[PDB]
């Protein structure tokens, strides 16, 4: 009989995982501070990795990779892509990005060298700015940096994707959320189901102060959008509909036009950091569920924008994905008495 402890109550995915674990009759839950656990569903902040794997008679397993923040916080991920030979500054699937600190190392004096070549060459010169609410998409820099310095945290600003793929009917934008589980053996598992978080407002390439047709967040769309839910329930188009659409409208499959690229990006990122975070020879073991956020341009080219390290699922898919976490991440290590994941290897 196995024991676990729950140190992040505000996690939908692992709330569900706790329930399924209990419902097996082979897992009992202990108090958040009882160190004699087999499993730790840890807190999102300052998880005590240094206290794991020092309990004799206990194989211990945690649901986070110490180190993985380097991939999952925006400035960090830019730094990692630019400096890592495996990805390099010549990376073809990440947009041009730069790390900018507020007025109160930095890259704005290297930014401007590229910005002005883009304005002179008479290219599209929209840039987006954000950190890890408070977003500015502009066409001239002195709006960007001016906004950055009103806030007080490190920011990244990056070449906005000016020619996205637009779903018809609607002429609207979207992003693709992929859910990837990495297990203690460092198998990379892409969940068969992705989601398209769409916008409900036709794409207005004119004024970039309206964020309703340029940012695809499930929140901003329920609250501040006109017709949230006109085309798909909850502004969420799943993979079968989207594949159908690509076949009907564009004469391709989702696998061919897009997924090949998403698998290549996922595998490349994770294999890049594998030496820094793998627990292959460690006294405790890690797994972790990641949410890779992708954007497809009008030429059917996939781009990575964020990796999130503590993602939520879509209500339809919680059951199946949480059961998959239990199967591959947890029962693999602690056995009980046709898989929904595609294994990424090359």
């Amino acid at each position: 009989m196995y024991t676990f402890v729950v140190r992040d109550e505000n996690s939908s995915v692992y709330a569900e995982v706790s329930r399924l674990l209990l419902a097996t009759g082979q897992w009992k839950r202990l108090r958040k501070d009882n160190p004699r656990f087999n499993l730790m569903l840890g807190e999102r902040n300052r998880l005590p990795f240094g206290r794991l794997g020092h309990e004799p008679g206990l194989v211990q397993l945690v649901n986070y990779y110490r180190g993985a923040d380097k991939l999952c916080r925006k400035a960090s991920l830019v730094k990692l892509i630019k400096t890592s030979p495996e990805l390099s500054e010549s990376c073809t699937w990440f947009p041009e990005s730069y790390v900018i600190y507020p007025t109160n190392t930095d890259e704005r004096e290297v930014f401007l060298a590229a910005y002005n070549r883009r304005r002179e060459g008479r290219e599209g010169n929209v840039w987006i700015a954000k950190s890890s609410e408070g977003i500015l998409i502009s066409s001239e820099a002195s709006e960007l940096l001016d906004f950055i310095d009103e806030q007080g945290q490190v920011h990244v600003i990056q070449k906005y994707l000016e020619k996205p793929l637009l779903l018809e009917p609607g002429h609207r934008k979207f992003d693709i959320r992929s859910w990837v589980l990495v297990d203690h053996l460092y198998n990379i598992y892409l969940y068969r189901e992705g989601v398209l978080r769409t916008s409900s407002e036709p794409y207005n390439s004119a004024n970039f102060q309206d964020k309703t047709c340029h940012l695809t967040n499930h929140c901003i769309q329920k609250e501040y959008s006109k017709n949230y839910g006109r085309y798909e329930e909850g502004n969420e188009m799943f993979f079968e509909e989207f594949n159908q659409y690509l076949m009907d409208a564009l004469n391709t499959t989702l696998e061919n036009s897009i997924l090949l690229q998403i698998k290549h990006i996922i595998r490349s990122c994770l294999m890049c950091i594998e030496p820094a975070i793998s627990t292959k020879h460690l006294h405790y073991q890690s797994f972790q569920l990641f949410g890779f956020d992708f954007m497809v341009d009008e030429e059917l080219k996939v781009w990575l924008i964020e990796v999130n390290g503590a993602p939520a699922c879509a209500q339809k898919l919680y059951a199946e994905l949480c059961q998959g976490i239990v199967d591959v991440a947890i029962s693999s290590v602690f056995p009980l008495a046709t898989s929904i994941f595609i294994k990424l290897h090359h």
Binding site: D33, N34, P35, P56, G57
Partner: protein, 424 residues
């Protein structure tokens, strides 16, 4: 290093004699004091309990005390009777009539100075005396009243030594007189203040063990005392045998007693034996030693939480298996071990098994469930005391009802202090 042993009153001297028989056998010493064992593990720490005398003889560092000579004579006539030095028999003639007050205030006071003389003589022949262990019941008169008088005297003369007791608790299922609760409560008040560590040997538990599981229909005091001498040999094995852990009374106090007053230990033993052939496996030894049914204090350990635990495995077995099983107990029941004392369970291994067993395990728990014991006593106490019944036996020896009220309160405070840490 050296321990001085005192046994007081009927029960104190009967269990004391059984203890000296049992560990004398374990250490290879015969009723004359002549060592006749084979191994040398038996002698490395033989001086903790024995004095070396002329002609390579071994004399227990044991003082025998009573207010009536009946039982002391019974010991002299008994099997090991002639191993004790005769000068260490200190007895009166009047008895104590199952009266704590006679033992503590009137008859006992008359005798206690000569006991303390013998105590002092034994202690000054000690290279480094670590302290004293006392055996006594709490429900009679000599053991409870005069043994606690002794203990506070001994503390006055030796305030920097360890005072340890084996204290048998009275049970109506095994009862001599109705005033036993009175006596016990007065004694517990004493013990809470003046011992460092007390083994609570419940006669209720010993009766239930003989009856429900040893299938003895009419348990005698002999049957109870066989269980007691097994427990005693077990809880003192790390004291008298050389091991990795070089243990003594003070380290045991330091490690077992997080707060001074909560020093009342629940002892346990496995396999439960009666006065067999199947060898126990280490998983079986470990499951039994933790079983409520193998403990000598009638309490439900699931009704409380373990502050500290010390466990002793006697026999030739796998130290690897012992470690795995102990860790498995803690990890599969961690609910019942306080989380604010990390790694509160420690284990020791001795190669020599007790007589007649290839393997055994002794358990020493400091559980908050021990409160159940005292609650029992307090209820019985109050049942009489509210009607002031049988008090005249005590006021006739000088005592005031106020003293009863004080001891009752102190015991109820002890119960509360245990309850404090059962919910922390």
């Amino acid at each position: 290093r050296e321990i001085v042993h005192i046994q007081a009153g009927q029960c104190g001297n009967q269990i004391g004699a059984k203890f000296w028989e049992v560990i004398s056998d374990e250490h290879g010493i015969d009723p004359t004091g002549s060592y006749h064992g084979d191994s040398d593990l038996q002698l490395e720490r033989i001086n903790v309990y024995y004095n070396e005398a002329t002609g390579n003889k071994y004399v227990p560092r044991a003082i025998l005390v009573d207010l009536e000579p009946g039982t002391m004579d019974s010991v002299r006539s008994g099997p090991f009777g002639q191993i004790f030095r005769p000068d260490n028999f200190v007895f009166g003639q009047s008895g104590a009539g199952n009266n704590w007050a006679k033992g503590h205030y009137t008859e006992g006071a008359e005798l206690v100075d000569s006991v303390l003389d013998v105590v002092r003589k034994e202690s000054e022949s000690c290279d480094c005396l670590q302290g004293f262990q006392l055996t006594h019941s709490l429900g009679g008169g000599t053991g409870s009243g005069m043994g606690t008088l002794l203990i506070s005297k001994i503390r006055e003369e030796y305030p920097d030594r360890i005072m340890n007791t084996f204290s048998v608790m009275p049970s109506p299922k095994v009862s001599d007189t109705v005033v036993e609760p009175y006596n016990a409560t007065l004694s517990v008040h004493q013990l809470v203040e003046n011992t460092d560590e007390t083994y609570c040997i419940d006669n209720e538990a010993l009766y239930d063990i003989c009856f429900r599981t040893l299938k003895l229909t009419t348990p005698t005091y002999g049957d109870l005392n066989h269980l007691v001498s097994a427990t005693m040999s077990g809880v003192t094995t790390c004291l008298r045998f050389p091991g990795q852990l070089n243990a003594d009374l003070r380290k045991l106090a330091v490690n077992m007693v997080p707060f001074p007053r909560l020093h009342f230990f629940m002892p346990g033993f496995a396999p439960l034996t009666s006065r067999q052939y199947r060898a126990l496996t280490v998983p079986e030894l470990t499951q039994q030693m933790f079983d409520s049914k193998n403990m000598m204090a009638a309490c439900d350990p699931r009704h409380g939480r373990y502050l500290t635990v010390a466990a002793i495995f006697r026999g030739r077995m796998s130290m690897k298996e012992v470690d795995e099983q102990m860790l498995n107990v803690q990890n599969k029941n961690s609910s019942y071990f306080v989380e604010w004392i990390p790694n509160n369970v420690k284990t020791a291994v001795c190669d020599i098994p007790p007589r007649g067993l290839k393997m055994s395990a002794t358990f020493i728990g400091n559980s908050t469930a021990i409160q159940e014991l005292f609650k029992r006593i307090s209820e019985q106490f109050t049942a009489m005391f509210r009607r002031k019944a049988f008090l005249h036996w005590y006021t006739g020896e000088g005592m005031d009802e106020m003293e009863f009220t004080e001891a009752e309160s102190n015991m109820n405070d002890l119960v509360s202090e245990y309850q404090q840490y059962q919910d922390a």
